[PDB]
Amino acid sequence: SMKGIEKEVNVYKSEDSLGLTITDNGVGYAFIKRIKDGGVIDSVKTICVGDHIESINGENIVGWRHYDVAKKLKELKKEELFTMKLIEPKKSSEA
Amino acid sequence: GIEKEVNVYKSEDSLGLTITDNGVGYAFIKRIKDGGVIDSVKTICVGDHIESINGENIVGWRHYDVAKKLKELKKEELFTMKLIEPKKSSEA
Amino acid sequence: SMKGIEKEVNVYKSEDSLGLTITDNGVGYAFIKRIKDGGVIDSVKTICVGDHIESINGENIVGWRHYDVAKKLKELKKEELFTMKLIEPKKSSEA
Structure with missing residues (x-):
């Protein structure tokens, strides 16, 4: 949009x-405030500071607070793929 | 929820x-007008938050932007919405 | 945690x-949505909107729903002290 x-x-x-x-x-939605240099998220360049997290592994996180969302991310199993839907706010608009 | x-x-x-x-x-419904189109669709309630319109995410839109989108929808056509119910709160 | x-x-x-x-x-982890002006809780100024209730009289209520928690508070005897552990969340969370 x-x-x-x-x-x-x-x-x-x-x-x-x-x-x-x-x-x-x-x-x-909760959103990303910081990405740590040299961490896993930093290597995935389609993820940005400001991105709102809409879901984790298909689970809707609308209206979860940031600590609940971080808890969920911490609980994900090590050495496994997970998915997320993000919304990236537009910083500019054409006319 | x-x-x-x-x-x-x-x-x-x-x-x-x-x-x-x-x-x-994160806009929600404040009023539903008696005898209007939304009033006839009883699964929609005062307090419901609008998560999307025709699959377009609008969480974090302000109320005027949400109303604009609704106004822009074509007359004489079906549209869809996902709504989130307000969270229940008991007193003590 | x-x-x-x-x-x-x-x-x-x-x-x-x-x-x-x-x-x-x-x-x-139910939390406080409103505090009524001039009520008992309003007079205790260390308690705030947004505070999560971790326990009541030492009983852990992590994972009770709000109605169960309110029932518990309503059932406490009039004219008696009770205690609570609360937690005031942070502005950010690391994952």
Whole structure:
């Protein structure tokens, strides 16, 4: 849409830690506040600071708080692929 | 929480609902007008949050942007929505 | 797990009603949605909107739904102290 673009990403959780920080506005979806240099998420370049997380492995996380979302990410099994749907806010608009 | 899907036929210019939010985003239904199109679709309720319109995600849109999209939908056509019910809160 | 500033509070249940509204995430760690002006909870200023209730009189309620929690609070005897452990969440979460 004019407000944001939906992306899908596959990520392999090779390590205990994925290397990101999650926050929210109190209301919508949680979103990515930081990506740690040299971590797993940093290697997947379609994921960006500002991206809102819409789902994890097909589970809708609408209205989960950031800590619940991070808890879920921590609980994912090591050495397994997982998927996410993200919305990337548009920073610019054409006319 | 409880997610619902609904189909609605936009027969009139006006659907007969009022959309609000709490200043930041994630719009919900404030009013449903008696005898309008939305009133006849009883699975839609005051308080329901609108997650999407025709598959387009709108969580984090402000109420005016949401109402704009609804106004822009073509007359005499079915559209769909996914709605999220408001979370239940008991007092103590 | 859950992470953040943990607080302990004593509250005297002087009235039938404590003056708070409770809600939750779909399974548990219910939290405080509203505090009623001029009620018992309002007078105890270490308690805030957004605080998650970890326990009541030492009984763990991680994973009770909001109605079960409110029932418990309603059932506490009038004119008696009770205690609670609460947790004030952080602004961000690492994964």
